[PDB]
Design a protein around this ligand. Structure first.
Ligand code: PH9
Ligand code: CL
Length: 564
């Protein structure tokens, strides 16, 4: 019986200028034409999200709960985590990270400047000596682009982001970075979804589905997960971390950061005004992904035991949960789900949209995607993940008409490379401009699982072949449903139908060819689909000579992480 937030009256303010509408770049229209369906959320709607996230939490724990928890601790107690030298942690800080309120900035932290490392050290020392005073935090409204869908009641309010000053953030890395990158995997084995690259996630889903006599799966959408995480949920997370073999110093920091940061604390807007008090999960700390995954898995697994799902498998990614089990008859299934929801609700994690049993894999949506099918060169059946490309496109359009620090279009191209909307529209549309500006060599930033990475377009082919396999360049005969969903979308937004992109693709693939080197290996593999005479595509050598290690290991959303 504790509120997720208390508010003072202070508005959530923006620090910069917030553009809500698409500018009208002549280039933007080379992609999307109905630029009035595209929109970005601003701190103008923050008060609506505030109502949504502010609620009371009732939570009753039980035997199933305690049994699973105990099993988790057991596995946790077999993990050993080290600390991180100020230096080591400083390197994990993104070049563009928010500057500290204490004189220095991101580059100063990255460049191990003196003033910075001195504050970072005073902060660390303060964590060891004071284990009670609530650390201060800032609450900003996020600004993400979407498309207008009248079927949902128009537009959606901006999401909130709550984070601590850069000093603290670098400490968090020193104390927990190694833990949140190892504890998760060790406690929930194969259920931990961040250990998989696209090719592996698909493989884990299909295999698990096909491994059931009469498969039955569902996705469980939790209404505002972060807001439901109770203080006991966070102290429980801590007790799990504490199971690891930690340095007496790392233990004091972890305990101190839990009591002072994670379990809640006060918030101020950009103007330094007292905004409110948080008593639920902070969206912008390092343990956000690890914490949500651990806690989402804990409750879910215990609910499976109250509902009696038969031989079930779970795949968790933060607050995103998908469950596949053995069917017990459509009616018994519907009922096992209602008890599942009832158990979850008791664990302080009610849902938004109530879960619904599904019997067709390709009709399940987890991590905003679904399995679909296509065929490789030798006409073999190949599975891959995809989604409605509306948002992806509406954003790929906004990022063409306004410069953005991190661009999703490159993340989508990588993660959804085998899809047809990514290959015929994204690759085509972008490698296009990266020629009308000669930037095939210029590295660009993008996020994956939260971690930030610097990637060069000219390396996409090797990368893709690594996450999706070589088939991803020769997939044909896509399922009609999919082909149709994309086409339907393109018509909605105003994006030239697939045929137009086929033409553009042949062209682009050309200027890229009559440019040889690497720009021609991209036009060769990334566009072998826009030419009748299809050249033979074989294993890329420079595809092995690349370690994508850090990539798919753990999740770091809101963790202010930068991988190099
Ligand atoms: O922010 C995150 O924490 C985050 C998590 C995430 C988890 C599981 C996924 O499983 C899938 C789902 C479909 C295909 C393959 C795989 Br493994 C995909 C993404 N998003 C991104 O990494 C992304 C990467 C790229 C593409 C999207 C949007 C932005 C840019 C954020 C997800
Ligand atoms: Cl179909």
């Amino acid at each position: 019986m504790s509120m997720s937030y208390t508010w003072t009256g202070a508005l959530i303010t923006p620090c910069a200028a917030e553009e809500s509408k698409l500018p009208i770049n002549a280039l933007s229209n080379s992609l999307l034409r109905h630029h009035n369906l595209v929109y970005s959320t601003t701190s103008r709607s923050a008060s609506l999200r505030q109502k949504k996230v502010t609620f009371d939490r009732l939570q009753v724990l039980d035997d199933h709960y305690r049994d699973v928890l105990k099993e988790m601790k057991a596995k946790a107690s077999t993990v050993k985590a080290k600390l991180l030298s100020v230096e080591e942690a400083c390197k994990l800080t993104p070049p563009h990270s928010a500057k500290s309120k204490f004189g220095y900035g991101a580059k100063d932290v990255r460049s191990l400047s003196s003033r910075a490392v001195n504050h970072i050290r005073s902060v660390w020392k303060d964590l060891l000596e004071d284990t009670d005073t609530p650390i201060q935090t800032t609450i900003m409204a996020k600004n993400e682009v979407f498309c207008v869908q009248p079927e949902k009641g128009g537009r959606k309010p901006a999401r909130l982001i709550v984070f601590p000053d850069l000093g603290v953030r670098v400490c968090e890395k020193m104390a927990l970075y190694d833990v949140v990158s190892t504890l998760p995997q060790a406690v929930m084995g194969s259920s931990y979804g961040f250990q998989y690259s696209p090719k592996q996630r698909v493989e884990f889903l299909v295999n698990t589905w096909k491994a059931k006599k009469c498969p039955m799966g569902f996705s469980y959408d939790t209404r505002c997960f972060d807001s439901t995480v109770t203080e006991n949920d966070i102290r429980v997370e801590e007790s799990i971390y504490q199971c690891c073999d930690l340095a007496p110093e790392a233990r004091q920091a972890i305990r101190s950061l839990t009591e002072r940061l994670y379990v809640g604390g006060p918030m101020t807007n950009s103007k330094g005004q007292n905004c409110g008090y948080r008593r639920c999960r902070a969206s912008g700390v390092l343990t956000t992904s690890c914490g949500n995954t651990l806690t989402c898995y804990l409750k879910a697994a215990a609910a499976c035991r109250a509902a009696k799902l038969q031989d079930c498998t779970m795949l968790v990614n933060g607050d995103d949960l998908v469950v596949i089990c053995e069917s017990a008859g459509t009616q018994e299934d519907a009922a096992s789900l209602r008890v599942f929801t009832e158990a979850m609700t008791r664990y302080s994690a009610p849902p938004g949209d109530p879960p619904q049993p599904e019997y067709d894999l390709e009709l399940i949506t987890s991590c905003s995607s679904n399995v679909s099918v296509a065929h490789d060169a030798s006409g073999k059946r190949v599975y891959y993940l995809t989604r409605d490309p509306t948002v992806p496109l509406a954003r790929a359009a906004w990022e063409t008409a306004r410069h953005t620090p991190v661009n999703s279009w490159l993340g989508n191209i990588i993660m959804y490379a085998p899809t047809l909307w990514a290959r015929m529209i994204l690759m085509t549309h972008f490698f296009s401009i990266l020629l009308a500006q000669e930037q095939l060599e210029k590295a660009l930033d993008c996020q994956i699982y939260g971690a930030c990475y610097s990637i060069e377009p000219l390396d996409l082919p090797q990368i893709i072949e690594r996450l999706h396999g070589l088939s991803a360049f020769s997939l044909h005969s896509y399922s009609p449903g999919e082909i149709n969903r994309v086409a339907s979308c393109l018509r909605k937004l105003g994006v030239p139908p697939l045929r137009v992109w086929r033409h553009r693709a042949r062209s682009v693939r050309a200027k890229l060819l009559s440019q040889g080197g690497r720009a021609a290996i991209c036009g060769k593999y990334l566009f072998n689909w826009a030419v009748r005479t299809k050249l033979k595509l074989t294993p890329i050598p420079a595809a092995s000579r690349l370690l994508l290690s850090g990539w798919f290991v753990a999740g770091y959303s809101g963790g202010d992480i930068y991988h190099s």
